[PDB]
Structure formats: C-alpha cells, structure tokens
Symmetry: D3
Subunit: 219 residues, 6 copies
C-alpha cells in the first residue's frame, strides 16, 4: 500500500501516515511524499483544511533510524494534527508543526533525542517549550518519558482529548467549523500568525541548528 493515504471530503484533505508496520517511521520516501502532499494541499483550490494523522496504533515514532534541514512548507491553510497514538522525537516535531492538535485518549508524546544521542533539527527545542512550557519541555527532553494525553491537555500542547474512536470525528468537527468561515480571511489571519511566529522563533531555530552542527562535529 502507499506510504501516505490521501482523502478529500467536504474541502478537508486528510493525510494519513501509512507505515504502521514500522510505527509510521519517517523514511526518506514517507518524508518526501508527506512534505509534497502538504505543498500540493496548499496549491489545490479544492482544499481548505488539512488533517494529519497516523495509521493506528502509533502516530509517528520519528525518523526511520534503521534506514538512516527542515522541510515543512509555508502554508496558509490550517493543519490539524489528530494524534492517534505515540508521537515520538521526529514525530513529536511533526505534531509541533501543526496549527491545532486534538488527541486520542491513547495519544502520548516523548522526546528521545538525548537517549539516542541525537540533537533536534526540526524545531523540538524551540517549539516544545513554546507549546508545553519550559519546565515540562526540559523534563520531557532530559527524561525521555512519555507525556500522557491528559497531561498534554493540562499543559496546552493539545486543545482537546477525545475517546479513541471519536478522534477523526472530532478533527472533522473542527475542520468543518473552519470551512464555514471566510476562507480569504482564514488564510490571511493564519499567514499573519505564521509570520509573527517566524519573527519570534527564528533566532532560536538558528541556535538549535548551530547546536546540532556542533554536536555532529564533536561526535
């Protein structure tokens, strides 16, 4: 089957990471396909909103390390992450790129970069404190322990936690609310939020990149 499933219904495009046999690990092929699908959704006049999710039971375990710069494209259409299970390391970075997250009761979040001896290059060290808080981000990154869905909700990492079998139902509800609004305005306002975020995070992203380069050279 394809590594990425694509559905478009009611102006909402759902992109489902589809390597469950490998915990939806981001192989070179899946990365290429996923990032291209985001760009294609942005360019497709039939699409107002994107949902990103994973084939059960894991959302995304991270980069395919067996097999082994940022790639997530500039978008003005909203991206909703429907986190169905574990979102780990590069998969947590994928979740952190989304505009809005909704979680299954089964979702959990972890950063194992330190454990596997890697430094983050897709924004974890910038966006995790931004979205879960400074102390909790540090606790996650230094322990490698899982953060539960309920704790993710308490911390602000996700907007909503629902029963597992209601996850895509819930994501479709949020998408439908967006679809009902003025799309020119939705896109203008989201572009602006993105520009403000880029202004506030770029120095940090450079610092993250520099720390990764220094790690690779020393290691």
């Amino acid at each position: 089957s394809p590594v990425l499933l694509v559905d478009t219904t009611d102006r909402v495009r759902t992109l489902t990471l589809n390597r469950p046999q490998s915990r939806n690990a981001l192989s070179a092929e899946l990365r290429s396909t996923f990032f291209r699908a985001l760009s294609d959704a942005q360019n497709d006049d039939d699409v107002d909103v994107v949902i990103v999710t994973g084939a059960d039971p894991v959302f995304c375990a991270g980069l395919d390390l067996k097999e082994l710069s940022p790639k997530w494209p500039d978008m003005t259409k909203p991206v909703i992450g429907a986190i169905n299970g574990a979102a780990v390391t590069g998969g947590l970075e994928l979740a952190l790129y989304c505009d809005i997250l909704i979680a299954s009761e089964n979702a959990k979040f972890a950063d194992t970069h330190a454990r596997v001896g890697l430094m983050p290059t897709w924004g974890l060290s910038v966006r995790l404190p931004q979205k879960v808080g400074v102390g909790l981000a540090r606790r996650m990154s230094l322990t490698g322990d899982y953060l539960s869905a309920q704790d993710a909700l308490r911390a602000g990492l996700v907007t909503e936690v629902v029963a597992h079998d209601d996850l895509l139902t819930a994501a479709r509800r949020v998408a439908a609310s967006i679809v009902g609004n003025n799309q020119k305005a939705v896109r203008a306002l989201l572009d602006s939020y993105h520009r403000i975020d880029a202004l506030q995070t770029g120095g940090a992203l450079w610092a993250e990149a520099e720390a990764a380069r220094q790690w690779m050279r020393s290691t």
Copy 2:
C-alpha cells in the same frame, strides 16, 4: 444613561461599559469615553486600581459594526478585567489588554475576525497566543467558536472563575489586596512588566498592523 458608568470606592475605580441594548458594542462614543476614562484614572491621585466590566449579560461584543489604530493608554496602575459574559472580537482584544482577568461562570471568549472578514488591529493576533497558547489561539481564530470560562481558566487566559453573582465581589478582593501594598512599588513593578512586554511584542504588533493594511488594500 451614560455609555460608561464610573464608580470610585476604596481607591478602586470601576468602569462599566454601558450599552447593553447593543451588547456593549464599542461605538465611537464609547471608545472615546472609555479610553479617556483610563487616562483619567491614571492621572487621578484618588485611584490606585481600575476594574473594567460590562453591563450584563454581555462583556463586550466588539466594535459597533452597524455604526462602522490602538488607543489603550500607557498606565502604571493595575487594570483588572471582570468578564461578566461574552467577550468577542474587539471585546476579546479589550480583555487581552487587561493586566489580570477574573471571569464569571458565564464568561465566554471568541474571535470572529475571520468570520466577518476583518483583520485584527488591537493586538488579538499577538496577545491571544501569548495568553491562551498558540494552538488554542489558532483554533479560536480559525473556528470562531466560543471558549468557555472553565477552558479559559485551564488555558491561562483568566486567573479565576467565580459564580456570576460573585464576579465583582471577587474583583474587589483582588483590588483590595493590591490597594494594601506599597503603591509606589506596585506602579514601578507594573511599569516594568509593561516595558518588558512592549519590548517582546512590538515586532509582532507591527506585523499584525502590516497584515491588516495589506488586507484592507487587497480587499
């Protein structure tokens, strides 16, 4: 009756938005009167603390669109928003300007800018992510849906949620605690918090203003 009610008791000045027949919409007259009242409170040696609230049952529905730059003045005296009902769009921006918010169980918060085809110019796109979190701000702005008082408390937008008939009781308790402190120090510390906030948000506020101008020109 006047569009703005003013009371001063125990060194606390309460400013009550008073156009309930129009959901306390910010007409030109109410904007002028309100912003002047803030400045007058700052200049009045009989006042230590301001409470802003609305005539029931709505806090503020936003700019008077039927009738139709930032105006909130530099202040060193604390402003407590006692949110008694819906705070929508420009009214949510008014709430976001306050130093400290307390909510009735009946309070709710929404951003309808996208729905009505307007871009924010009173800081919503900067202060909403700052005070409710990135994902929740994006969810609010893109859906236009209401955020409940309890969810506002969970997210950090408000400090306290109380029964409706205890709202101004609660706001007076917080004000009285402030009044009991060293007012020179209260003002020096709040001025400093404001200066730090201005330093951290100005680039973003410029970006918001630029996005609004680009919207007006394109639209």
Copy 3:
C-alpha cells in the same frame, strides 16, 4: 550545622538550604555557599544531576533582609527544584532558575517585592510571566498573595505535585530517569535550551535591571 547540606547518591547531588531557624533566608554566607556548590556540581565528574531543596518546613523565604546582581552560574547539568514549602520573593526567583520543578502539596509561591518596597534583580519579572503566565504573574506580584501547589501545577510553574513525604522520592525518580540517558547528549541539549532561553530573555533581563536601578536612585 552547615548552612548548606550536600549529599551525592547515584550520581545525583542534593543541595539542601539549611537555615530553617531563619526560613532558609539567603544570607550572604548561604548565597556564597549555594552558588559555589552549583559551580562545584557542574565541575564534578561524579555528578550528573542536581536537586535543590530546603530544610522543612519552608523552601526559601527570600533574601535575609535582617542582615541586609545575579549569581546563578552557567550549568549544563540539570537542576531539579524540589519545593517543600513556601518559596517567597528571592526564594521564588531561586525556584524560577531551576530547569524542572516538583512540588509538595505544601509548597506555595509568592512575590512580596512590592510589599517590601523592592524591585526584583534575579529575574522574577522575566521568568514569572514566562513560567506561570502573564496575568497570573501580574496578579501574584501586585497582590503578594500565595499561589498554591495545585494552582502552580495548573499554571505550568511545576511539573508535578506529590504528598509531602514523597517529595524527595519523586525528585529522585526524575533524576534517575535523566541519569539513565546519554549524559553527553543530556548536557548538549540542556546547554542548547539554556542558550535559546538566554537569547529570548536577555533584553528583558536588562530592562528588569534598569528598572531596579531607577528605583534605587529615585527611592
């Protein structure tokens, strides 16, 4: 007895503020000793993680005012604050320096700078809004009221609240999880988080310092 107790067990160094007769107030001697102990822990190859706590029942009441620039050193080893009781003013600033906080059910947090007519110089006005939110930080600083452990957890100031007699048990669990990871990577990632934080907070820290100097001169 010494003003600072030191234990090293399982590569974790616990530094216990030990002036309970004075609410663990930071005398000149305790400040010197504590800040030196942090540096010594950083330099000691037998130590991976630091826990900071207080002799019961107070964590730290602040600077010793009876007796009466920032001193907390650059560190790449994680510092866990185990807050056992009240953390007030300079003691709240000590808590705010920690990477990760865990609280006893008995912990409480307050800022009395305004009440005692002092401006903060150890980062309270920068780190309190960063870690508890803008409105709650302003409410704390202007009222001087205590924030409970449960409210600190809701707000994101602490990562976990436990029964009092489980506090150091809990802190040791988090420390042990860190100790089990790749220490080169733990330190590289924490150094990076610190560098990103320094980049984002330095302007604010300057503003805080300038406001303190202006207060001292005017007062």
Copy 4:
C-alpha cells in the same frame, strides 16, 4: 501634465515625481499614483528594475502640508533612487525606502519633522540611523540642517555622487548591470534582504508609530 511621469526602456521603469511647481510635494493624488505605480511595476513582466527620481530641481520636499500609515508596497524588483535635488522630511523617507541611492552633486537631505512639529510615520526614525549612522541621524533630525551629497556619500546614505547632468546616466548604468543578471535570483536575493530587514526593523517601526500616536494625542 500628469503628476507622475512613467517611462520603460531596456526593462527599466523610471517613475518621475512631476509636481515641480510644488517642489514635488506628495499630495494625496501623487501619493496614490506613485504607490500604485510601484505595485504596477512589480506586477509587470516587462519590468526588471525601477528608478525613482524627481522633476528638477527638487527631488521631493515632503508631504503637501498646504493640502493637509506607510504605503510603500512589498517589492522584489530593485528600486534605485536617483536623487536630483533636495529630499526633505517625507521626501527623505521616500529616499530611505529605496534599495540603492545615487545622488547628483546637487542632492541634499534634511529632516524638518521637529521644525514643523510633526513626528515621522514613514520610517525616518528607524531608517535614517540605519543608513547615515546614529549620531548623524540625530544631528539631522534635531537641527533640521541640510546634509550635502558629499557628506551623504561619506556617511553611506548614497552609493555614488555624480555631476547633475550625469545622474540618470548613472542610474541607468546600475540598472543595466542588474538587468544583465539572473532575474529569478535577483528577486529571490532582494526578497531575502527585505525579509531580513523587516525582521530587524519591525519593533522599531512599531515604536516610531506609537511615538507618533502619543504626539498626536498630546498635541
């Protein structure tokens, strides 16, 4: 005659401010026409480079005060200012918007905002120190005195000073060099320079706007 002359030769569009009877003062009509012409040049596939100049003997004396937000559009095509005479106040702000300036021996530059009791809103207080240096910008703004073409060259405000009758010859030489390069790359690189500049100047531009608003309200 039209208030703005337009020529397109060798893929270079020259926009000549054409109200010499009024020192090329920026009336409402000329502002509208000029800013629209910039946008039209950006959108016109027949144009690679813009030259802005004035009908002799003045470049631009500023806003038409007799008759009486920023409007200069986002552009990726280079704009060369050929300063033929005095560039004063709003006219100095027009010069400061250009990517590259070349001056006649007759060019001179002045800021009279203070003298006429106005605050700048088109970036003078940000871009003048950026392009002529801090001390010289302050000297200009506080004295209102003219800066000569030679002193403008020494300071870095202009790239080249030529005999008056060679001014547009010189501007065409620079334009032709640009036209000979890879235009996709020229535009990508200039867009990037503009984005970097926007990141570095936005906070300052907000501060300038806030100071102007405070002036208007106080005055």
Copy 5:
C-alpha cells in the same frame, strides 16, 4: 576648583569635566557630580541642550584607577559631546553615550580595557561597533591603539572635525540650530530615538554585563 564646571548661555548648558591634573579621570566624586548635573539639566526648564567637554588637553582618560553599573540618566534633551582630546576607555564610553559628537583635530579615541585587564560595563562593547563599525571596533579593542579624529570622522563616530580653537564654537553652532527648533518636538523625537535604541541594544547590554560578571568571578 570644582571637579565639574557648569555654564548656561542661550539655553545651552555646558558641563566641563575639570580634573585636568588627572586627565579628567572619573573619580567617584566626578562621576556623582557629572551624572547629577545631567539629571539637573534634564529637569531645568532654562536648558534645552547640553554640551559635554573636558578641560584641555584630554577629554577623559577613563575611570580613576588609582582611586579604584551604568549611571547615565534617561534624557530627552540633546547631549553634544565636544571631544577636545583623548577619550580613553571609560572616557570613550562617555563619548559613546552622547547623541552627537564633534571633535577637535586633537581628539583621539582608544579602548584600553583589554590592556588593563578589565571588561567594559558602560556599553563600550555594544556602542563602539554601533558607532564606528564592527571591524574597527574589534581592531580598537584588541590593539588598544588610538583612532585619530579624521579616522573617527571617516568611520562615523563623529559628525564633524574642526580646528582645536573652534571646537566649542562649533558645538555652540549645532546647539543653536537645535535651540531654534520646536523644543516639544525635539524632545519627543529624541525620546523616540532613545526608545528605539534601547529596544535594539538591551539584549546586547545584558550580554556585556554578564561577560563582565563572569570575568570578575574567574579573575
């Protein structure tokens, strides 16, 4: 004689550093007196403009090291430095605080911090690259060599170089031009320039302060 001479003529207050027997070194007394005189000038309605100069033949050799935080106050009135001779180390920092510099042909500028084993705490490491350029600032600081008046003019550190016996004549000319303008506007515009500068330099000033503290502790 007094350590600081004061004259007020034509609404211009000249403050002359007056310890020529000690190369106008900034003793505790002279620092106190000078910084107070700046504040007094700001508060004195008889004064529009300040000139700072030194008793010949040295402007200021720096802190009085024999005898041995920033103190220069917030001002909205312009300060013109008339540099009559050598401006070294702390004296170069005094020059760097001025809004506008004019130099005698005899002026020269040097940074000897490294040579004497001190780190700067009055902004040299921020303002020297800002006002003379990155490479030249680094060359000055690392060599300790003098920068001539002509080279200071070329680099942008000073606005004008005049014969020695014309120095205060020249400074009075610039002051008189300022005095002829709208003083409300002069002050509003200079306050704004100062606020923009503070926004852009505060992070750097914190970094300078932190580097000095780290030097003192290591040394």
Copy 6:
C-alpha cells in the same frame, strides 16, 4: 604543494589559501583543511592571533563550482583577514567572517551569487549590509560589480588599505599590537563581541538559510 600553507611566528599563525592555479577556490579539500586549521589555531597554546590570506594574485574566488551549512568555528582568538586580491562570493563570505580586515590596494570585493543563480548560505546577506551598509550591499549583490579597496575603506568593510607589498607587513603590525596585550582579556572581550553579534544576527541567519532552502526547492 599543500592546499593551505601554515606559518607560526611571534605567536601569530598565518593561514595562506594555496590553490592559486584555481584562484584559491574553496574545494572540499581546502574547506576541510582551512576550517580544521582555524580550530587547531584556537586550541594551540602557542598561538594568540590568526592571519588569513591568499596566495597571489586572488584572495579567494569562492566555492569550487567545477568540483560542485556554515563551517567557520567558534573562536576567541582574533582573526585578521589580509585581503591580497579579489574576494568573490564565498570568498567575500570568508572575508566577512574575519574580525578585522586589512586590504591591499589590489583588493576588490564582489558578490556574484545572483549571477550564478545561487543563494548565499555563509552569511553574505546578513554580514554584507552589516559591514558595508544596506544600500551598498544591495548594489553589490544585485549588480555583481566589484567594490574597490578604496571604496571598501570608505564604506567600513576594511580598516586599512596599504600598498600590495606592505599587506602582510601591515597585518603583522596589527597582530603584534594584539599580542602585546593581556591575552586572557583579549579573548574574553572578543568572545563577548562574538556573543553579542550572534544574538543580533541569528534570526537573520535563519532567514538567509530558509531563503536558500526555498530557492533550492523551487529551482
């Protein structure tokens, strides 16, 4: 012969780019060797100061395009660029990394990125406006024309221009002045200048990197 010549005399290490047959183009081998030599100089207690120069008659023509992230290491020892001839594109970026530049009368500087259809990734778009001014940087990048040594001196890109046969004589004079100072202080002060620069430029460097990635993907 080796691609990089190394000499150490009087505590000064001269690194001479040595592929004159290829205009000192930065092949993979020369990049590796050069960047390693910088790190080795930093680590070598026999070295206080580095001079970088090229085998005549070209300084560095840029990346070896025939053959075809930033690599310049963190250093606290000063690096003096002695620019002996043309410094083009990547070679101009090498020059821009140096702390202090001195030029031969034969030096010239150019940016051909646009001409060859490449975006800069070694800081040209950040450091060129920083060191030569905004307008001149834009003129250089968009024209591809050479900047002369004298114009480089006028603009602030270099500190000194000397006869060609005096170039390394001059560089040794500056190095010797540095060597005569307190080396602990030289390094502490330069580290601080570098940290301040990193704070001020990181956001811009991220933006440059993002623009390059977007170019590679579109192209």
